[PDB]
Amino acid sequence: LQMTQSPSFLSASVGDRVSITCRASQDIQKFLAWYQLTPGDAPKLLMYSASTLQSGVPSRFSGSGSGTEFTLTISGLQPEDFATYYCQHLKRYPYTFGQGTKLEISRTVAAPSVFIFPPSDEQLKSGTASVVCLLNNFYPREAKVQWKVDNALQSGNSQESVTEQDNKDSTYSLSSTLTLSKADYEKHKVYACEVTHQGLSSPVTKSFNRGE
């Protein structure tokens, strides 16, 4: 018996009335609960028996449905309502949850500010260089980064991560790292970070010359 959620990702403004649905591969009557999960906090029960509001949960939250379709609805999204939601059935074991729905805040498109940090002399001592590309405060979250050493496109020698939408400006930030050996680093001059983003009509390239 599986629970499917939709949308998986939903963007909305603070104050909007949004609705998340949860379907069931079979009929589970009213044995369905909802939960709110904000990283760092313990999961919070918001609704059970499909429409019974959990003790201590703002009335802007309401549930409906029975059978295979159920709906969680939030009136006037609050800054803190922007998290991930999961429904769960309790018809019979094994109990299962939907894949969740992540709700983030929509805003204007902002291109990232791309800065590049060559390896520090200190790290080079050891024998490995870490070149870092920073994409700061951009929206949407979608963004691609490609390293180019002396123009040659890199692949498989870099890792990256993005922060969660900022609480203040609803922007996202990204950090990419090019990990090369010391000897591989002293072998080339140009270390380029090619950034692809909606706010950039065409991929931008921020680079520098080794030893300059």
Binding site: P43, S175, T179
Partner: protein
């Protein structure tokens, strides 16, 4: 009524994991409890339940290696997972399996804050912090970015702060990444006024308790001056 979990942050593969939940405000024997995991990448997964009657309601996907129980003298309920593999890595939560004798199953209403269990052979190790120095390459307008590279450490987590918690505005500490070396590496940055770049002292405070590593690195500007 409160629930606090406790157990290792790291478990060597093939070994047996032991997670424990301590209760408060209630007697463990008078209620039903449960464990739920969240494998980074996936969603939520019901592990199994524990009752006074000792009934066996576990997830079929774990059944063979799982064992749940309750210890009334210490007022706790626990989880035993044998033969762990990388697929068992996840933050584990304990909760109350709220049920009504007539109406039946209601929900999981009280949840613990959970604990991250990482399955790895990796040896505990402190990070090496490198500076992400502000320069003409990290400046735009009157704003300059600087930071710190916390490279090669295990296991998670490491915390970062700037100027002993005095600087928080414009700070960005990124999610760590696991390198094929089996070691973690993250970065924390901060955008600051370019003008203060000569006067204000910037220092990232790195702390990794697993290996009792406390590093304070000063980040100096880098130019041809």
């Amino acid at each position: 009524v409160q629930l606090l979990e406790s157990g290792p942050g790291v478990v060597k593969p093939s070994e047996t994991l032991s997670l424990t939940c301590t209760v408060s405000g209630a007697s463990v024997n008078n209620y039903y409890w449960t464990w739920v995991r969240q494998p980074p990448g996936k969603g939520l997964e019901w592990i199994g339940n524990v009752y006074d009657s000792g009934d066996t309601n576990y997830n079929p996907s774990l059944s063979s290696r799982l064992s749940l129980s309750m210890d009334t003298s210490k007022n706790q309920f626990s989880l035993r997972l044998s033969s762990v593999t990388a697929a068992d890595t996840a933050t584990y939560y304990c909760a109350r399996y709220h049920r009504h004798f007539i109406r039946g199953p209601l929900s999981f209403d009280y949840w613990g804050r959970g604990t991250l269990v990482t399955v790895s052979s990796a040896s505990t190790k402190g990070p090496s912090v490198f500076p992400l120095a502000p320069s003409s390459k990290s400046t735009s307008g009157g704003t300059s970015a600087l930071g710190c590279l916390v490279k090669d450490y295990f296991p998670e987590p490491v915390t970062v702060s700037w100027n002993s918690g005095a600087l928080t505005s414009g700070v960005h500490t990124f999610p760590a990444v696991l390198q094929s070396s089996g070691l973690y590496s993250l970065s924390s940055v901060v955008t600051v006024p370019s003008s203060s770049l000569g006067t204000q002292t910037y220092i990232c405070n790195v702390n990794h308790k697993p290996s009792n590593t406390k590093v304070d690195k000063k980040v100096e500007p880098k130019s041809c001056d």
